[PDB]
Amino acid sequence: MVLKLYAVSDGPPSLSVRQALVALEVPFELINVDFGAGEHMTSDYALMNPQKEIPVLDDEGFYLSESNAILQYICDKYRPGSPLYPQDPKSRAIVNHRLCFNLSSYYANISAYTMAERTPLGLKKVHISLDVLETYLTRTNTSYAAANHLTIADFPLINSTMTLEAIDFDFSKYTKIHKWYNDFKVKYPDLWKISESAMKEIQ
Amino acid sequence: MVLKLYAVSDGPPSLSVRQALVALEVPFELINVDFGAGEHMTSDYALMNPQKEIPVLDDEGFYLSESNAILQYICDKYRPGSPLYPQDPKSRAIVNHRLCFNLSSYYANISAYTMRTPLGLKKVHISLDVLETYLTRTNTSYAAANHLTIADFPLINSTMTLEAIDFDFSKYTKIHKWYNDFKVKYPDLWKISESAMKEIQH
């Protein structure tokens, strides 16, 4: 496992990359970055990721940051035929969209509230993000975020939603989200264990 | 049948999708969304994009929002062999990274300022410094390769908003050369950016 992932134990983007690597059976070495000590802020770390954020992948000297791009690369390079990242352009676009939607909106709004500051408008924006994902699940009428099977689009949304559970936020009125999120735990308990370990830390 | 793009005349994500469609010679119908009238906030618009943001693509009933995903889709669907979006996993990852970097960081920091505080100004310079760093390490003429890719358009249009406010970024040697070389090598594509720049300047 010469593939190296620099990650943090309670960070949803890190968890998503680990779940994908585990689901794809791609061996890797995990480096727990010492966030409290500022390890991601050193020049050595910036040699790998000039953005100074976690995670970053080192694939035989190829340094790749941005967890969405890391998710896409692990599939494209090591499992190009896997349904975890379909090759059909339309099906692939739904996955790509859901990845962008998590980065641009869903995780952005949810984490602003589940971290640090909790305001009426922040609470409203959590509900708007849930409403939009609920809307997407209603329109596709799929069991998972981008298809009727698990894809890399699921992991970032799962780990964003996990932070709501971490603060005992009730989102059960979002029927399809609640079912999708809980079905994930039952169908993929090994992958959920990665989210659950972080959830207990965030708690 | 013709693609339909719902866009706004002064929005960098809209401009990037138009440049890609034009570069790939994919024909489309342009719908200029009436932002001032709130057209992107109606229920009919939300049928296409529940996020209520611009742009959104309608490809014969397939509704796709998020400009980065739209860029990837038009390449994957209509020009899979194009060097504008390489198929080699590593080369593709550099493109994908640069798209994410624009969305998460470069456009986020630059637009917060060009649309002003000491910390916001510092964050503009950090974003420029990071992109300057990436260009130095790849030693490439463009953002992800020695040829134009879809990664270039979002970064070009983020950088255009600095020019729109007369922000001097010439200290960033490689960014300045890359940006100005784009205008000279691709004048038709730059005309799309320039028309918005004149609106933003007003």
Numbering used by the authors:
A (entry chain B): 1 to 116, 123 to 209
B (entry chain A): 1 to 115, 124 to 210
What do the authors say?
The crystal structure of bmGSTu2 was determined at 1.68 Å resolution and solved by the single-wavelength anomalous diffraction (SAD) method using the Hg-derivative. The purified protein was crystallised in a space group of P41 with unit cell dimensions a = b = 86.26 Å and c = 58.77 Å. Structural elements, characterised by the STRIDE program for protein secondary structure assignment, showed that bmGSTu2 contains 8 α-helices and 4 β-strands. Two discrete domains, N-terminal (residues 1–78) and C-terminal (residues 89–233), were connected by a linker region (residues 79–88). Similar to other GSTs, the bmGSTu2 structure adopted the canonical GST fold. Superposition of the structure of bmGSTu2 onto that of nlGSTD demonstrated that the α-helices and β-strands of bmGSTu2 were conserved across the structures. For GSH activation, an electron-sharing network was proposed for a delta-class GST in Anopheles dirus (adGSTD3–3), and the network includes Glu64, Ser65, Arg66, Asp100, Thr158, and Thr16221,22. The corresponding residues in bmGSTu2 are Glu66, Ser67, Asn68, Asn102, Pro162, and Ser166. In the bmGSTu2 structural model, the electron densities from the following regions were poor for modelling: Ala116 to Glu123, after Phe211 of the A chain, and from Pro117 to Tyr122. Our mutagenesis experiments indicate that the residues Pro13, Tyr107, Ile118, Phe119, and Phe211 in bmGSTu2 play important roles in its enzymatic functions. The decreased LD50 value observed for the mutant after diazinon exposure indicates that bmGSTu2 is involved in diazinon tolerance in vivo.
Glutathione (GSH) S-transferases (GSTs, EC 2.5.1.18) are cytosolic enzymes that are present in both prokaryotes and eukaryotes. GSH conjugation is essential for the detoxification of xenobiotics. Previously, we identified a novel GST obtained from B. mori (bmGSTu2). We also found that bmGSTu2 was capable of metabolising diazinon.
